[PDB]
Amino acid sequence: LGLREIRIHLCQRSPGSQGVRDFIEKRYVELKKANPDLPILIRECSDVQPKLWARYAFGQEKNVSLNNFSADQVTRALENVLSS
């Protein structure tokens, strides 16, 4: 509409992606402490380019990427779409 859902893909290893793993430590419990409506999704492993995905407006897919970041870089990368 949107949006609708947010899917944070990641990997278990290749620590170059660790920001996401760190992002959960940083903002998940807090980030989703509000928005008690959005059903953001952690699924498992794209092993490479842990593309964040999001879906809205009659099911149109919009895929940002991330490759090697820090902790707060992604925290601010999420509200890019979430404010909209």
Partner 1 sequence: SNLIEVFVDGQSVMVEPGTTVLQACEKVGMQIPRFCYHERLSVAGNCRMCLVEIEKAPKVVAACAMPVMKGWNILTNSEKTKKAREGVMEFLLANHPLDCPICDQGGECDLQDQSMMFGSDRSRFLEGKRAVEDKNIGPLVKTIMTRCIQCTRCIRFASEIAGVDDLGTTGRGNDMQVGTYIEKMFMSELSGNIIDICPVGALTSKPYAFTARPWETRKTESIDVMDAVGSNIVVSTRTGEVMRILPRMHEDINEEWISDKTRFAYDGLKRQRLTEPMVRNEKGLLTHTTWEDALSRVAGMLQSFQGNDVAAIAGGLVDAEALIALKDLLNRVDSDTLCTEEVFPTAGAGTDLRSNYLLNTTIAGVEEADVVLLVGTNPRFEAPLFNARIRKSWLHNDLKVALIGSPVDLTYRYDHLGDSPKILQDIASGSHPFSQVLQEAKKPMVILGSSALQRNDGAAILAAVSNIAQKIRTSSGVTGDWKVMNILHRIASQVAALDLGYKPGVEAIQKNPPKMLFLLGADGGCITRQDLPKDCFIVYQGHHGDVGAPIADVILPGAAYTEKSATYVNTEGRAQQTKVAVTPPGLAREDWKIIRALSEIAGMTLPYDTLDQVRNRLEEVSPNLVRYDDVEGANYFQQASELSKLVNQQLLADPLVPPQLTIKDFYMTDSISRASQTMAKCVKAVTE
Quote the tokens at residue 36: 């008690």
**Per CB under 8 A, does 48 bind partner 1?**
no
Scan for tokens 């419990």, then name that residue: 29
Per-residue mark of binding to partner 1, 6-45 (x: CB under 8 A): -x-x--x-----------x---xx--xx--x--xxxxxxx
Quote the tokens at residue 67: 């490759």
Cα–Cα dist 4/27, whole Å:
19
Question: Interface residues with partner 1 (CB under 8 A)?
Answer: 1, 5, 7, 9, 12, 24, 28-29, 32-33, 36, 39-47, 53, 55, 57-59, 61
